[PDB]
């Protein structure tokens, strides 16, 4: 029963996505999303990169398929 379905790959945000701060004052550091607060705001924790523990938005940040 070969029933070919396309691939439709994504980048879905489980606790353990390392992200990339595109604008702000981290400006290219590596956080880790920890407590998803709402659909647009997202918590971060990357404390040895020099970041705070804040709840940034989603338009302010990009991410990567690398995931712990």
């Amino acid at each position: 029963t070969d029933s070919i379905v396309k691939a439709s790959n994504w980048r879905l945000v489980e606790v353990g996505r390392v992200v990339l701060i595109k604008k702000g004052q981290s400006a290219g550091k590596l956080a880790a999303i920890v407590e998803i607060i709402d659909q647009k705001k997202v918590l971060i924790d990357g404390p040895k990169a020099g970041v705070p523990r804040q709840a940034i938005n989603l338009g302010q940040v990009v991410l990567t398929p690398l995931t712990f």
């Binding site: 029963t1 070969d2 029933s3 070919i4 379905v5 396309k6 439709s8 659909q39």
Partner: protein
């Protein structure tokens, strides 16, 4: 509310063998193929295990979680419309004028034409297309009976007959005659 995520679980029987890409669906099974242009629903698909198909929406509205049910009701017809198939029946009702129909091949077209509706002299003509096949049914009481694989093919022309054989310029609820659908069946049920 703009719901975050829903799904449905479309079944694929063993006789049919689906083959989809990005938004174009090509079903094929025991009795030929159907293909469905589906480029306006904005939903994604993921195989789970060889018979169950996942459909998905993420961050819909109200209407974009309603149409996510509409894409379900199209595909499950297609696995039914290839394996189980359809067959309609379509009964005469006529008083004081027999409603005699006959089929014509007028230059590649295959019209089905209807004569003596409500005592007119005028000759009807109704075209069909591929994917249907009528049959003037006998051993039973005076029906036209057609079949096919889609549901856009069987119902559309056959209800257009029921759109043709409505009386006009008289009243309606007293001149009851015409052609009307009786039962929407499958060509092979009950196995």
């Amino acid at each position: 509310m703009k719901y975050i995520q829903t799904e449905q679980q479309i079944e694929v029987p063993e006789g049919v063998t689906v083959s989809i890409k990005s938004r174009i669906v090509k079903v094929v099974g025991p009795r030929g193929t159907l293909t469905k242009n589906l480029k306006h629903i904005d939903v994604t698909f993921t195989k789970v295990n060889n018979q169950l198909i996942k459909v998905a929406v993420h961050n819909g509205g109200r209407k974009h979680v309603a149409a996510l049910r509409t894409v379900k009701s199209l595909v499950d017809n297609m696995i039914t419309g290839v394996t189980k198939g359809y067959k309609y029946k379509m009964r005469y009702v006529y008083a004081h004028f027999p409603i005699n129909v006959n089929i014509v091949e007028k230059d590649g077209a295959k019209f089905i034409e209807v004569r003596n509706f409500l005592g007119d002299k005028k000759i009807r003509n109704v075209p069909v297309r591929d994917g249907v096949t009528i049959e003037f049914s006998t051993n039973v009481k005076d029906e036209i009976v057609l079949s096919g694989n889609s549901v856009e093919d069987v119902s559309q022309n056959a209800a257009d007959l029921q759109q043709i054989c409505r009386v006009r310029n008289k009243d309606i609820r007293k001149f009851l005659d015409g052609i009307y659908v009786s039962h929407k069946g499958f060509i092979t049920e009950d196995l």
